[PDB]
Write an enzyme that holds these catalytic residues in place. Structure first.
Site, PDB file in Angstrom:
ATOM      1  CE  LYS A 124       6.981  15.753  11.548  1.00 47.92           C
ATOM      2  NZ  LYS A 124       5.558  15.185  12.004  1.00 47.92           N
ATOM      3  CB  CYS A 194      -1.303   8.629  -1.460  1.00 47.95           C
ATOM      4  SG  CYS A 194       0.049   7.118  -2.008  1.00 47.95           S
ATOM      5  CB  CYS A 201      -5.004   3.723  -7.112  1.00 48.62           C
ATOM      6  SG  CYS A 201      -4.249   3.234  -5.921  1.00 48.62           S
TER       7      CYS A 201
HETATM    8  S1  SF4 Z   1      -2.196   5.939  -7.825  1.00 45.18           S
HETATM    9 FE1  SF4 Z   1      -2.502   4.954  -5.728  1.00 45.18          FE
HETATM   10  S2  SF4 Z   1      -0.442   4.573  -5.014  1.00 45.18           S
HETATM   11 FE2  SF4 Z   1      -0.376   5.945  -7.035  1.00 45.18          FE
HETATM   12  S3  SF4 Z   1       0.078   8.036  -5.780  1.00 45.18           S
HETATM   13 FE3  SF4 Z   1      -2.257   7.738  -6.576  1.00 45.18          FE
HETATM   14  S4  SF4 Z   1      -3.313   7.057  -4.657  1.00 45.18           S
HETATM   15 FE4  SF4 Z   1      -0.684   6.770  -4.364  1.00 45.18          FE
END
Ligand code: SF4
Length: 215
Positions: A124, A194, A201
C-alpha cells in the site's frame, strides 16, 4: 473483462459525499522523496495531525537521510512520539534509511518490488510512494478501507479475502487514471460514511445501489 454494475454512479456519489477541505517546503525534489516515504511510514494507526506533528518536529531538526542516521534511537523515539507503534517505526526508519544511504545514493527506490523489501514498507505504501514521489501509477493502494468498501459495493468479480486480492481484482477493470485517486476517496468514504461497523447507510447516496445495504 468483467466490471461491477453502477460503479461510475457509485463513485460520483462518493465524490459528492466527501467533507470540506498545506504544501510543505522541500529543499530539493530528492529530499522531498525521502520525506514523502517517511510520512507514509509514520501514518500507520495515527491521526493525520499527529503524523504531521512528528513530521514537523523532524523537519525542525533537519530531515535528511544522513541527519536521521545521526539521530540515536532514543532521540528519534521522542521526536515521533506519539505516533502509533512508534517503537517499531523507529526501527523501520533507521534500518530503511541505512539501506537508502548504502544502496540508493540517499534516494528512495523507484519500483514496488524494491520498496516493499524495505523495513516497514508494505505494498500500500509502495504504490502511494510511486505516485507521490515519482509521479508513477504502479497500482492501487488497498488498505482496510478500500478492501471493505470494494467488497460491500461488489467491485470485485468475486468476494476477496485479502487487500492484495482486492488490488488485483480492482486493477482488472478500474481505469488507470483513477488508481491513485481511488485510495484517498475510499479512505475518506470509509472514515465518515462507510464505517467498519454500523455504516451510515441511511445517510449514504449509494444505498439504493449498494448490494450490502440491499441485503
Ligand atoms: S449504503 Fe452503507 S454499505 Fe453501501 S456504500 Fe453506503 S455506507 Fe457503505
Amino acid at each position: 473483462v468483467w466490471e461491477p454494475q453502477d460503479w461510475q454512479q457509485q463513485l460520483v456519489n462518493i465524490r459528492a459525499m466527501r467533507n470540506k477541505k498545506t504544501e510543505l517546503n522541500f529543499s530539493s525534489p530528492k529530499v522531498r522523496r525521502y520525506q514523502v516515504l517517511l510520512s507514509l511510514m509514520l501514518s500507520s494507526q495515527t491521526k493525520d495531525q499527529v503524523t504531521a506533528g512528528a513530521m514537523q518536529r523532524l523537519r525542525a531538526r533537519g530531515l535528511t537521510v544522513d541527519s536521521i542516521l545521526q539521530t540515536d534511537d532514543a532521540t528519534l523515539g521522542k521526536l515521533i512520539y506519539p505516533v502509533g507503534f512508534w517503537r517499531s517505526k523507529v526501527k523501520y526508519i533507521k534500518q530503511t534509511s541505512a539501506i537508502l544511504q548504502q544502496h540508493y545514493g540517499g534516494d528512495i527506490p523507484a519500483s514496488v518490488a524494491e520498496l516493499v523489501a524495505l523495513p516497514g514498507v508494505g505494498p500500500k505504501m509502495a504504490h502511494l510512494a510511486m505516485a507521490v514521489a515519482w509521479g508513477t501509477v504502479s497500482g492501487i493502494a488497498v488498505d482496510t478501507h478500500v478492501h471493505r468498501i470494494a467488497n460491500r459495493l461488489r467491485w470485485t468479480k468475486k468476494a476477496t479475502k485479502s487487500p492484495e486480492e482486492t488490488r488485483a481484482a480492482l486493477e482488472e477493470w478500474l481505469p488507470r487514471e483513477l488508481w491513485h485517486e481511488i485510495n484517498g476517496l475510499l479512505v475518506g468514504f470509509g472514515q465518515q460514511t462507510c464505517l467498519p461497523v454500523h455504516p451510515r447507510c441511511h445517510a449514504c447516496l449509494n444505498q439504493a445501489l449498494c448490494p450490502a445495504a440491499q441485503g
